[PDB]
Amino acid sequence: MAVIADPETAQGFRLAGLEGYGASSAEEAQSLLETLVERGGYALVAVDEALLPDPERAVERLMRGRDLPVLLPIAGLKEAFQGHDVEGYMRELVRKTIGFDIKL
Amino acid sequence: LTVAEYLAFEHDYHVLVILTDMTNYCEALREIGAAREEIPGRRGYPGYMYTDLATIYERAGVVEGKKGSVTQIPILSMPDDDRTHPIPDLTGYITEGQIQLSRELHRKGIYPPIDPLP
Amino acid sequence: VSPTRMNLLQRRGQLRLAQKGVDLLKKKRDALVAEFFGLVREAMEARKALDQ
Structure with missing residues (x-):
């Protein structure tokens, strides 16, 4: 699986076997993420929230065709x-899925 | 039908008969029946309409020992495209089949718009 | 559609079928709601474990 995150943890990702990339802007994050979508290989991409809070919103037109890629947002190193x-x-998440706000 | 029967069974012709609109014949029959206070059938038509139509349709056929034949193609209009109307019902009870046109196929530009299931 | 008594009986049967289907779909939605609540609790627990 691949993961977009800070350059500091990229060496640890490479050690653990994860495909890590270091970036700081939303433009390069979205372009690299859709490049990972189109390229053949692992189907899971992990996202730090500092670059792209909703990667599904980034690939929403590629998501409408196929739903096999998996995206997961998480907090950054800081x-x-x-x-x-x-x-x-x-x-x-629940307010998005139902459309309803309950159980704070 | 008198002329058709004469030609077919006395001069060995092969006669094809076309009746343009049996609905108008039924309307005239209803007029005469309602003038005479007859007992009505289902909607308005007289109770003897089955027998009267039967004397028209049943004159077709073929006869043993003769070369002639009579074939009938009546044409009639179902009023609200309704198969349960009295005129199509009695016609389907008397005749030997039916060809039913479809309006949905006609709206799509299909000609001839024959619906094969009914 | 031609109005007959048999047609009226068929239409009323259709109405009863539709109402029973509505009730059955409501019961199915209730079951899905219960499963959704359990799954969201599990997902929250997994998320905080992943954070740690």
Whole structure:
């Protein structure tokens, strides 16, 4: 599987066997992500939230054709150690899926 | 039909008979029946309409020992495209089949618009 | 559609079928709601474990 993240953790990704790339702007993140979508290989791409909060919104026209690629957003290296509540992400997820806001 | 029968069974012709609109014949029959206060059939038509139509259709056929033949192609209009109307019902009870045209096939430019299932 | 008594009976049967189908689909939606709640709880737990 591939993962777009900060350059610091890219060496650790390469050590663990993960395909890591280092980038800091949304433009290159989206272009590289759709390049990973079109290219043959692993179908899973992991995204740091600092570059692209919703990768499905980036590939929404490639997602309408095929739903086999898998995308996963996660906190970046700086956001990881300072931390946050993941339950806000859960509330946003359920509010997106149903269209309804409940169970804070 | 008198002329057709004479030609076919006395002069050995092969006669094809076309009747343009049996609906108008049924309308005239209903006029005469309603003038005489007859007992109606289902909608308006008199109760004896089955027998009267039978004397028209059943004059076709072929006869043993003769070369002639009579074939009939009546044409009639189902009023609201309705197969359960009395005139198509009695016609389908008397005749030997039917060819049913379809309006949906006609709207698509298909000619002839014959619907094969009914 | 030609109005007959048999047609009226068929239409009323269709109406009863439609109402029963609506009720059955509501029950199915209820079951899906329960499964959705369980799955979202599991997903939240997995997300925080992944963060740690």
